[PDB]
């Protein structure tokens, strides 16, 4: 809300955490799939995330963010609806880093539904 924003957005297959912030962690605004009513396999879907960033940009009303230099981390399909629709005031998705969750096979994995 300082006259600019920086998008530390996230989307685990559930709880697509759309989060346009500032450079430090000074808590600009956040979003969700759990912010606009969708649960039934419309959570991370392109036809259910049409207006997923305006629970952020016009619940700002004083900033209207202007760039990203984004770090699109925590990737999913909700990523795209959380970037292209991050241009509804001039929020100007500008740069990327190609750094998503890429751990190095040191972790231990949770389980597999057949």
């Amino acid at each position: 809300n300082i006259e600019n924003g920086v998008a530390h957005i996230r989307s685990t297959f559930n709880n697509t955490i759309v989060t346009i912030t500032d450079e430090f962690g000074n808590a600009l605004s956040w979003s969700s799939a759990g912010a606009l009513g969708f649960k039934g396999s419309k959570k991370s879907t392109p036809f259910a995330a049409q207006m997923a960033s305006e629970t952020a940009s016009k619940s700002a009303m004083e900033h209207g963010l202007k760039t990203v230099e984004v770090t699109v981390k925590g990737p999913g399909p909700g990523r795209e609806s959380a970037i292209r629709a991050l241009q509804s005031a001039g929020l100007e998705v500008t740069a990327i880093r190609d750094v998503t969750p890429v751990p190095h096979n040191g972790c231990r994995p949770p389980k597999r539904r057949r």
Binding site: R97, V99, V102, H104
Partner: protein
């Protein structure tokens, strides 16, 4: 083809190098298996010092 390259060098290993700080597969390259093995080895004697990143 080339002569030796060792842990004196860390960017003469940039010919066959990625953008994250690693090297491309030998199958996609395809040169002197012996010479390319030691040449690439020295860059891993350099991932010791890690002059080339892992991720940014």
């Amino acid at each position: 083809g080339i002569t030796h390259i060792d842990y004196k060098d860390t960017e003469l290993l940039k010919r066959f190098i990625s953008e994250r700080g690693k090297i491309l597969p030998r199958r996609v390259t395809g040169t002197s298996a012996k010479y390319q093995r030691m040449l690439t080895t020295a860059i891993k004697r350099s991932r010791h010092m890690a002059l080339l990143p892992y991720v940014k």
